[PDB]
Design an enzyme around this catalytic site. Structure first.
Site, PDB file in Angstrom:
ATOM      1  N   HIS A 177      45.608  48.329  46.815  1.00 64.26           N
ATOM      2  CA  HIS A 177      46.976  48.167  47.352  1.00 64.26           C
ATOM      3  C   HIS A 177      47.806  47.288  46.409  1.00 64.26           C
ATOM      4  O   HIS A 177      47.286  46.424  45.676  1.00 64.26           O
ATOM      5  CB  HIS A 177      46.934  47.607  48.765  1.00 64.26           C
ATOM      6  CG  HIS A 177      48.242  47.129  49.296  1.00 64.26           C
ATOM      7  ND1 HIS A 177      49.124  47.954  49.969  1.00 64.26           N
ATOM      8  CD2 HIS A 177      48.862  45.931  49.182  1.00 64.26           C
ATOM      9  CE1 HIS A 177      50.232  47.263  50.262  1.00 64.26           C
ATOM     10  NE2 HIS A 177      50.087  46.028  49.814  1.00 64.26           N
ATOM     11  N   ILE A 179      49.517  44.527  46.476  1.00 57.49           N
ATOM     12  CA  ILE A 179      49.377  43.078  46.299  1.00 57.49           C
ATOM     13  C   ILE A 179      47.947  42.671  45.968  1.00 57.49           C
ATOM     14  O   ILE A 179      47.618  41.474  45.976  1.00 57.49           O
ATOM     15  CB  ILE A 179      49.787  42.324  47.603  1.00 57.49           C
ATOM     16  CG1 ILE A 179      48.733  42.554  48.693  1.00 57.49           C
ATOM     17  CG2 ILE A 179      51.157  42.776  48.074  1.00 57.49           C
ATOM     18  CD1 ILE A 179      48.915  41.715  49.939  1.00 57.49           C
ATOM     19  N   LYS A 180      47.047  43.636  45.741  1.00 54.22           N
ATOM     20  CA  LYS A 180      45.652  43.281  45.469  1.00 54.22           C
ATOM     21  C   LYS A 180      45.469  42.976  43.989  1.00 54.22           C
ATOM     22  O   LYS A 180      46.359  43.273  43.178  1.00 54.22           O
ATOM     23  CB  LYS A 180      44.686  44.308  46.022  1.00 54.22           C
ATOM     24  CG  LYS A 180      44.911  44.770  47.439  1.00 54.22           C
ATOM     25  CD  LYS A 180      44.580  43.813  48.563  1.00 54.22           C
ATOM     26  CE  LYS A 180      45.238  44.277  49.867  1.00 54.22           C
ATOM     27  NZ  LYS A 180      44.538  43.942  51.108  1.00 54.22           N
ATOM     28  N   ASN A 181      44.357  42.378  43.602  1.00 56.91           N
ATOM     29  CA  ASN A 181      44.106  41.965  42.231  1.00 56.91           C
ATOM     30  C   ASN A 181      44.317  43.059  41.219  1.00 56.91           C
ATOM     31  O   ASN A 181      44.799  42.791  40.104  1.00 56.91           O
ATOM     32  CB  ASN A 181      42.764  41.235  42.116  1.00 56.91           C
ATOM     33  CG  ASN A 181      42.894  39.813  42.668  1.00 56.91           C
ATOM     34  OD1 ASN A 181      43.601  39.603  43.657  1.00 56.91           O
ATOM     35  ND2 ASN A 181      42.242  38.828  42.071  1.00 56.91           N
TER      36      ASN A 181
END
Ligand SMILES: O=C(O)CCC(=O)C(=O)O
Length: 366
Positions: A177, A179-181
């Site tokens: 997603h 906003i994930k790393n």
């Protein structure tokens, strides 16, 4: 000049990867998916990987593949994103929410063991904010009782536990997603050490098929395949993983230092050996200690043009779950749920940004 709590680290490599896929004419699931699965196996040390359209989809087919349904119980913390609860409920199973450590927000072995019954069919620990859960104790419970362990590793791409990557063994689900790393806007991957299970996952994410013209449904499945277009972006981000996590780690350090002179309380690091991916930098805002509430702090920051996230409003405090489990009480979860917030933390964050946040914090911190 609004400063959001997160921003994707998109550059020339992500665009080039998309251009190559568009130019090839093979835009949906194909060789880039196969490559991403091979790279995740190389990254983690596990044997099989199934790319999907999101980590929620991955959780759905994982539970589905275990045969979870009516009458079954699934242990999970309430302190997690509601998608896990929703997938357990929608399969017709009963979620059994348990409390978490008050300072790490991770589900404890004690809380899990106490909730185990003959109907428990899965245990789903969450590697919270970039740190790892106590896998040795959790797997032990899993093996003692004969209950599958499905790790939610949406915050853990790059996380390590006692010298081994999350996902190296067992089954772990990662998220791509925004906003994930690492990201491809939406996507995820299920890494597992079980070949029959991996085969079920591959079929369930693509219509339950065993596409060829006379291909056929073996058992009904959903449509959760990840396009090569997005898979190529994930591959480009995966190549940057260490640099990107290194930037998040550095910014976490400054936050740590800055918090020394502030009343807000960051989470505690787990006691076991680990490598933190630093997906989020969460702080607790207790009104009696800080002088301001969590909600008031978030709104104050927003006035200053600084965005914050809330990871997470406990599942059991949300409408559907409140009405379904009215007597459920989970003190450490609720205490944190009323006080946590996520401060700006992303790879492209600058010192102008960082210092902007700390200056806003002092303005508001008494
Ligand atoms: O934008 C999405 O698709 C999902 C966002 C999400 O799950 C979140 O609230 O963190």
């Amino acid at each position: 000049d609004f400063l959001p709590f997160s921003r994707p680290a998109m550059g020339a490599e992500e665009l080039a990867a998309v251009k190559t896929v568009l130019d090839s004419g093979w835009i949906t699931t194909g060789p880039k998916n196969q490559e991403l699965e091979a790279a995740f196996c190389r990254l983690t040390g596990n044997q099989y990987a199934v790319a999907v359209s999101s980590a929620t989809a991955g959780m759905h087919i994982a539970l589905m593949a275990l045969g979870i349904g009516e009458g079954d119980e699934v242990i999970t913390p309430s302190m997690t994103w509601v998608s896990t609860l929703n997938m357990i409920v929608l399969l017709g199973a009963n979620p059994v929410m348990v409390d978490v450590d008050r300072d790490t927000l991770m589900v404890t072995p004690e809380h899990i063991e106490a909730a185990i019954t003959p109907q428990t069919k899965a245990i789903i620990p969450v590697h919270y904010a970039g740190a790892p859960a106590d896998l040795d104790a959790i797997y032990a419970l899993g093996e003692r009782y004969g209950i599958p362990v499905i790790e939610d590793a949406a915050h853990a791409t790059g996380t390590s536990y006692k010298g081994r990557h999350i996902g190296a063994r067992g089954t772990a689900i990662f998220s791509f997603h925004a906003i994930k790393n690492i990201t491809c806007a939406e996507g995820g991957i299920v890494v597992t050490d079980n070949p029959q299970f991996a085969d079920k996952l591959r079929s369930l994410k693509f219509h339950g098929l065993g596409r060829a013209p006379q291909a056929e449904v073996l058992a009904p499945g959903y449509k959760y395949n990840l396009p090569d277009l997005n898979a190529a972006i994930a591959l480009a981000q995966l190549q940057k993983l260490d640099a990107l996590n290194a930037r998040r780690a550095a910014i976490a350090a400054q936050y740590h230092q800055a918090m020394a002179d502030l009343p807000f309380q960051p989470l505690s690091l787990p006691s076991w050996e680990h490598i933190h991916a630093w997906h989020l930098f969460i702080i607790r805002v207790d009104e009696a200690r800080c002088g301001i509430t969590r909600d008031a702090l978030m709104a104050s920051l927003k006035t200053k043009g600084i965005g914050t996230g809330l990871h997470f409003r406990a599942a059991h405090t949300q409408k559907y779950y409140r009405e379904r489990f009215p007597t459920l009480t989970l003190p450490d979860t609720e205490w944190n749920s009323e006080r946590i917030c996520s401060l700006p933390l992303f790879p492209d964050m600058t010192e102008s940004d960082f210092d902007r946040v700390i200056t806003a914090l002092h303005q508001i911190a008494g």
